Design a protein around this ligand. Structure first.
Ligand SMILES: [Zn+2]
Ligand SMILES: [Zn+2]
Lengths: 92, 320, 705, 301
DNA sequence: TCGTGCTGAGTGATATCTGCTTTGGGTGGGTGGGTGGGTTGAGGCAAT
DNA sequence: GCAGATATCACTCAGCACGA
């Protein structure tokens, strides 16, 4: 009767998602030599889990990562953009 | 013709700590000895005594357990007794096989009724004795001794130990089903082709039963605070320790403090489900309890019991 | 009619059973001996005919079930067999005391009866395999027959302290006594029968729980998978009881004599496969680690100390107050929105709050695990499907006897047996069935591993006792079997061959290390086993291993580590030639995304893993990270989650050896990742999706330049 | 020759080849052998004087139109020990076979006796082993036991179905005949005609009933150790045994000690406990039978 | 070296279904109602 | 009309082999 919510390229490419990550990802995340490795890993996973929950509350963190892997493998439009970001850096 | 999948017993994860405790218990039961007036193996001699006289229960002194192996074995058995009890029985059975093979089986014509002997381990001489008021929920599943006065004694009843069912569709057999607290029936038929899942018939002839007696005890009067209602408790006796406690007298029990759930909520065939003013609400969430809540009630499984308080030739023989 | 026919068959079998004989209760002697009926041999022949006509030709098993239902084996055959053994013992006593004394009236009759009972027992203890062509009747009567065979094994090992084994040994002595050149085919048949009897006794193991799957899993679910008879417990049929009974009856001596004299006093066609299968079954589940290390008290104290640490770590997550105390937390995310998390412990620690928010989610992504039981392909339970850690516990005496027996065999006749088996099956490569291949490879691998461990532990023993392991013919046979298995997609034999190849590599490396001068001969063998096709196959093996069982992945890890070690050693020592082999290109062939995926999937089960496996996986991780500088491969997200899970207080034990490697690898990976991320902002998104394969930006993506 | 018609010997019966006694007895050949041996014992047993005791007993049974043939356990043990052992270990099936054999023997003397009564129950009189309500344990389940006590309760006489015949509600199919155990009600969880798990009902107005009564047996006050609680059980009396005792009597009950699943007990106690009751096979009052009774010879004195 | 169409498999939501009482007892009441039913007897204690 | 326990059907997804 109702199509299942699914992590499509459209949601990822929306303002919330990859654009949000590129906007503010280095400022919030911070790996410090003084702090232990566990704390830095916790901080990184803390940022990414919050972003995923804001974007895709449906799936847990590990499931979100696996779905992201599959989508990146499949979707061509996602590949287009992923190549594009790298291309801009080569330009820079 | 049909689709089937198989689960292998070797896939099970074994308990390393349980096996280590089993080995330690076996070693203690084997090599332990006490200096007499000569030195003799107390427990090997006891096992020989049982073999000759056909006894099920083997009494073990707790002080001996504490003495050996730096007391680690004693700590393991006392702190967590419900967990380690099966492993102790396995070790006892292995030792019996090693030394007295014939004791394992139950004892003009042949008799096919040769069932496995259900050994029972009795612990006594605990360094400390508690009271009914000192019983707490922090020590559920621990080996402890209590004292009280027998106020009632229910009749001896048979308790379903290991059932054996037959499918109503293909007339198969499923044996060695463990009953925890209620009438438990199998779920999946072992036959790959059969589709039966909830229709079974109990084989009352091939099953096994244990003697069961419930004894109520109240705290001794002198121990009670002035002008206070005595607190009662329920004690369960099994095996050879039935009809040992008697009404009125004062006895010392040793065993494991267990907690009995409200079996009606869990689901009993035939039966229907179901001071404090609604505050005694149990725990909910299980799939079996779709919307109902489970409340608990403390009890006591006792393995040892002690009674605190014809012609000339018969008496003379007793006298040394 | 069919039901009436079954009833008539059961009645006839019961009547035959009552006609075999019975205890002589009339006699005053009341260890009641089992007297024999006037036509006992007639009943034995009738039962043999029943088996032949019904069980095999008609593709049925009702006859076996009928025989078991009336306790024919446990109440008749064992009595006559043990009484025959006792009578022979008395006869030998009389003969030794006085040569003229001869009281064995109808001696020939007694021997024929004993042989018939032994053959019947062997027939009743044959392995049961379920195949696709088996009839529905053959399928519906599997569990019952398995339970009956378990009861048979228990009675065999228990009745009169297992004197049945002594009787079989006595038959073996009677057979061997006659001269080699005077031996007729019947004697070889009897020897094969005895060996098959021993194999059947050792092999019997509990069956498997098969359940119909026509409809969905009920919410009640599976309650138990116990598949034991009523009166039989696990310890009764455990290998410990088998070892104890064999030692008490002096069974190991017979096998030692048979193997020692092979190729000097016996034929090889009726001997090789029986002993080979017997010894594969003997070490089917044994783990060599247990063999080579009160002690129980110290181990119990250590385990209790570990459990106490685990409990302390768990206590940190539990609330001091009761469940219904209450307390709601509202954690606000940076985008001005707050999510509510309950629980007292979530108030103080943010990590616990986030973790609970994660767990509260209900939807779970699919995980499909299609696995086939060994019984489906007609293979027995062994290291292939058993847990990595499942250890059979032995008593001190039984373990000592097992060690002594294995040591004597290896010192005596392992080489001759291996030579005979490998020659025979090189003559007969084509018709090999999966069972024989798996058994032979597993036997080879187990014995080589045990010899390696013994050599490492002590120098008193010698390493040449496994000389046939390095012999060329065995290596060619193993390689051919592995290649055929890979070509035909037979994963079980593939796993067995992987284990065997790992063991061969360990052996070759150890022998080269021991004596480098004599390794010039060894240098010949290595050139063969590193062929281009073989190198490609080994490189591809890890790639496919990702979507398979844990044991297969463990074997992949082991084989990869051994291959890398041997290749590095040989490249460093001299110029490796199969085409000169450079370590760089072979290393590059091993750096691929599927390999890393397989490794990550393996390390996901670190809780059930051992220290050595963790050390090896992290050694390979270090190799990929540093030696080749391919950090882009490991810049994934599953690795980050796994690292945090393992370094968490509730994860891998803090006071553990592996934690040092985990911490070092973390530190290094985090430092390098921070450097790269600072250099390349785009990697903030690359951590999620797999690496590109685009020529324009692939080089920049991977190497950053 | 039909294999099912073959009969074993007497000695072979002692040699048991089966998991349990009931399985051994239920086998066709063993059943036929047991029937033959019981018939021989009934038709060939003689006392010191040589009089055929059971012939006269059967004649008297026919004279009074009674449906009970009292059999002495000692005579059976002396004649065929194995049969006595089987009867002690497995009372239900042995008693069924004995009832059939006794109905054949009775028809031997009175050919048309089937018209008067169709079933002649066999009652064991003197069981050597005597138990008490205190010493009964799980090992005595499903075996013949002789106990002594005093009746302290009794219920009225009611008819109980002896052969039931159920029916379905989805398809309306009617199930076959069954045997109604005195302790547990017949339960059906699946049909055979429509083969559905739907509800059921009791139908087949044609049925054969039997009398049924229940009494509460309590331990004799004297036998109870000093100041201990007496132990009581419930005894079920079927046809031919109802109204054989009234409250305040000392009786000896020989019967089968059976058990069955009771949901109420499990819910109450909290453990899997089964209710137990004794299915009476013979009731006697508690020298001889009665001193007050006199004989024709005494009346002359 | 690799991309995509076909397939078996398994949950999710939804269809029918039984049940909607239940129960002996005064801290479940009598505005829930008797067509849902409840029929002691000994022993202890205040009043006198 | 209403809540709960139960079983039915339909739809969509990850693996597989071949062809490009
Ligand atoms: Zn079934
Ligand atoms: Zn029907």
């Amino acid at each position: 009767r109702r199509p299942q919510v699914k992590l499509t390229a459209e949601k990822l490419l929306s303002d919330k998602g990859l654009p949000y990550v590129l906007k503010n990802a280095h400022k919030r995340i911070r790996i410090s030599s003084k702090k232990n490795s566990y704390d830095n890993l916790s901080n990184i996973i803390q940022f990414y889990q919050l972003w995923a929950h804001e974007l895709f509350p449906k799936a847990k963190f590990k499931d979100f990562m696996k779905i992201c892997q599959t989508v990146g493998k499949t979707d061509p439009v996602l590949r287009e953009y992923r190549v594009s970001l790298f291309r801009d850096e080569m330009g820079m | 013709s049909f689709k089937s999948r198989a689960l292998n017993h070797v896939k099970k994860v074994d308990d390393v700590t349980g096996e280590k405790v089993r080995e330690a218990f076996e070693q203690f039961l084997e090599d332990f000895s006490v200096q007499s007036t000569e030195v003799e193996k107390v427990y090997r001699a006891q096992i020989e005594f049982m073999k000759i006289y056909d006894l099920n229960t083997i009494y073990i002194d707790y002080q001996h357990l504490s003495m050996r192996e730096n007391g680690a074995l004693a700590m393991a058995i006392s702190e967590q007794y419900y967990r380690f009890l099966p492993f102790l029985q396995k070790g006892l059975r292995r030792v019996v096989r090693k030394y007295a093979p014939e004791l394992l089986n139950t004892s003009t014509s042949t008799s096919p009724e040769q069932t496995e002997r259900v050994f029972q381990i009795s612990f006594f001489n605990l360094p400390t004795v508690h009271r009914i008021r000192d019983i707490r929920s922090e020590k559920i599943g621990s080996l402890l001794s209590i004292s009280g006065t027998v106020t009632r004694t229910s009749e001896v009843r048979p308790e379903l130990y290991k059932a054996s069912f037959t499918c109503d569709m293909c007339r198969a057999i499923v044996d060695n089903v463990e009953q925890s607290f209620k009438y438990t029936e199998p779920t999946f038929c072992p036959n790959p082709s059969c589709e039966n899942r909830a229709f079974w018939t109990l084989n009352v002839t091939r099953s096994r039963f244990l003697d069961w007696q419930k004894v109520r005890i109240q705290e001794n009067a002198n121990e009670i605070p002035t002008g206070s209602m005595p607190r009662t408790l329920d004690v369960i006796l099994r095996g050879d320790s039935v009809e040992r406690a008697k009404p009125g007298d004062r006895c010392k029990f040793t065993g494991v403090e267990i907690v009995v759930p409200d079996v009606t909520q869990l689901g009993l065939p035939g039966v229907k489900p179901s001071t404090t003013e609604g505050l005694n609400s149990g725990v909910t969430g299980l799939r079996s309890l779709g919307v109902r809540d489970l409340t608990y009630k403390i009890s006591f499984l006792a393995c040892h019991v002690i009674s605190i308080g014809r012609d000339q030739e018969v008496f003379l023989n007793s006298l040394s | 009619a069919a039901d009436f026919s079954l009833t008539v068959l059961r009645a006839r079998i019961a009547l035959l059973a009552t006609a075999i004989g019975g205890p002589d209760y009339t006699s005053q002697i009341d260890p009641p001996p089992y007297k024999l009926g006037d036509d006992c041999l007639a009943c034995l022949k009738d039962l043999k005919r029943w088996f032949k006509l019904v069980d095999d030709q008609q593709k049925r098993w009702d006859v076996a079930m009928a025989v078991a239902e009336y306790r024919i084996l446990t109440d008749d055959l064992l009595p006559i067999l043990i009484d025959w053994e006792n009578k022979c013992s008395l006869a030998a006593k009389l003969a030794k005391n006085n040569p003229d004394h001869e009281e064995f009236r109808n001696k020939a009759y007694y021997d024929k009866i004993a042989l018939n009972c032994l053959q019947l027992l062997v027939l009743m203890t044959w392995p049961l395999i379920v195949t696709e062509q088996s009839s529905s009747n053959q399928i519906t009567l599997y569990g019952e027959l398995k339970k009956h065979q378990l009861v048979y094994k228990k009675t065999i090992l228990s009745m009169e302290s297992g004197k049945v084994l002594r009787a079989a040994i006595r038959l073996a002595l009677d057979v061997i006594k006659i001269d080699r050149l005077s031996r007729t085919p019947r004697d070889n048949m009897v020897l094969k029968l005895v060996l098959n009897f021993f194999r059947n006794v050792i092999a019997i193991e509990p069956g498997e729980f098969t359940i119909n799957t026509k409809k969905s899993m009920p919410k009640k679910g599976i309650t138990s998978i116990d598949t034991l008879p009523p009166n039989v417990s696990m310890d009764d049929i455990s290998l410990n009881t088998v070892i104890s009974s064999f030692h008490k009856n002096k069974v190991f001596g017979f096998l030692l004599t048979l193997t020692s004299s092979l190729s000097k006093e016996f034929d090889q066609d009726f001997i090789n496969i029986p002993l080979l299968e017997i010894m594969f079954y003997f070490t089917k589940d044994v783990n060599q680690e247990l063999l080579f290390p009160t002690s129980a008290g110290f181990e119990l104290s250590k385990l209790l100390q570990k459990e106490h640490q685990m409990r302390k770590n768990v206590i940190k997550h539990t609330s001091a107050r009761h469940s219904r105390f209450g307390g709601l937390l509202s954690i606000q995310t940076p985008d001005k929105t707050r999510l509510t998390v309950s629980g007292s412990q979530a108030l103080v620690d943010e990590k616990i709050a986030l973790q609970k928010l994660d767990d509260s989610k209900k939807w779970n992504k699919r995980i499909i695990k299609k696995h086939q039981s060994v019984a489906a392909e007609g293979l027995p339970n062994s290291l292939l499907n058993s847990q990595t850690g499942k250890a059979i516990f032995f008593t001190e005496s039984n373990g000592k006897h097992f060690k002594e027996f294995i040591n004597n065999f290896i010192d005596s006749g392992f080489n001759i047996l291996l030579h005979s088996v490998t020659n025979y099956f090189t003559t007969e490569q084509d018709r090999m069935v999966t069972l024989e291949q798996v058994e032979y490879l597993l036997f080879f691998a187990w014995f080589v591993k045990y010899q390696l461990l013994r050599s490492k532990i002590d120098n008193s023993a010698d390493i040449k006792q496994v000389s046939e392991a390095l012999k060329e013919v065995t290596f060619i046979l193993v390689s051919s079997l592995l290649r055929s298995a890979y070509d035909l997609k037979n994963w079980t034999v593939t796993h067995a061959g992987m284990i065997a190849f790992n063991e061969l590599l360990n052996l070759v490396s150890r022998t080269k290390a021991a004596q480098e001068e004599d390794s010039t001969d060894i240098e010949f063998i290595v050139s063969r086993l590193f062929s281009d096709e073989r190198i490609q196959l080994l490189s591809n093996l890890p790639k496919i291993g990702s979507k398979y069982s844990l044991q297969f992945m463990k074997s992949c890890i082991e084989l990869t580590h051994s291959v890398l070690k041997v290749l590095e050693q040989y490249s460093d020592d001299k110029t490796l030639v199969i085409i000169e082999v450079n370590f760089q290109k072979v290393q590059a062939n091993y750096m691929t995304e599927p390999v890393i995926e397989t490794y990550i999937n393996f390390l996901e089960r670190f809780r059930e893993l051992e220290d050595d496996s963790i050390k090896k996986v992290f050694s390979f991780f270090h190799r990929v990270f540093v030696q080749a500088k391919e950090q882009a491969l490991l810049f994934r997200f599953d690795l980050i989650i796994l690292l945090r899970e393992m370094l968490s207080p509730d994860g891998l034990d803090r006071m553990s050896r592996s934690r040092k490697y985990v911490s070092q690898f973390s530190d290094y990976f985090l430092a390098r990742l921070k450097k790269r991320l600072k250099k390349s902002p785009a990697w903030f998104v690359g951590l999620l999706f797999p690496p590109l394969h685009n020529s324009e930006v692939g080089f920049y993506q991977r190497y950053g330049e | 020759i039909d294999p099912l018609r073959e009969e074993l010997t007497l000695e072979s019966l002692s040699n048991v080849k089966a998991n349990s006694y009931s399985e051994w007895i239920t086998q066709p050949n063993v059943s036929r052998t047991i029937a033959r041996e019981l018939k021989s014992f009934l038709l060939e047993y003689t006392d010191e004087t040589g009089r055929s005791v059971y012939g006269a007993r059967i004649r008297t049974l026919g004279e009074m139109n009674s449906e009970s043939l009292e059999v002495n356990y000692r005579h059976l043990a002396e004649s065929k020990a194995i049969l006595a052992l089987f009867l002690a270990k497995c009372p239900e099936e042995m008693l069924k076979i004995f009832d059939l054999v006794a109905m054949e023997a009775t028809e031997l003397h009175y050919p048309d006796y089937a018209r008067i009564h169709s079933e002649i129950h066999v009652r064991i009189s003197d069981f050597p082993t005597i138990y008490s309500l205190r010493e009964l344990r799980e090992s005595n389940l499903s075996s013949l036991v002789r106990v002594t006590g005093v009746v302290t309760r009794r219920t009225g006489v009611f008819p109980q179905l002896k052969y039931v015949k159920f029916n379905c509600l989805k398809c309306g199919s009617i199930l076959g005949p069954f045997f109604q155990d005195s302790n547990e009600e017949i339960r059906i969880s699946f049909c055979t005609n429509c083969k559905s798990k739907g509800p059921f009902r009791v139908n087949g107005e044609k049925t054969v009933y039997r009398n049924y009564q229940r009494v509460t047996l309590q331990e004799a006050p004297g036998t109870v150790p000093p100041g201990r609680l007496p132990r009581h059980r419930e005894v079920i009396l079927l046809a031919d045994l109802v109204d054989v005792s009234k409250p305040g009597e000392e009786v000896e009950v020989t019967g089968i000690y059976k058990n069955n699943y009771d949901g109420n007990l499990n819910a109450k106690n909290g453990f899997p406990v089964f209710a137990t009751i004794i299915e009476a096979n013979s009731i006697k009052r508690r020298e001889g039978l009665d001193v007050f009774s006199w004989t024709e010879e005494e009346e002359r004195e």
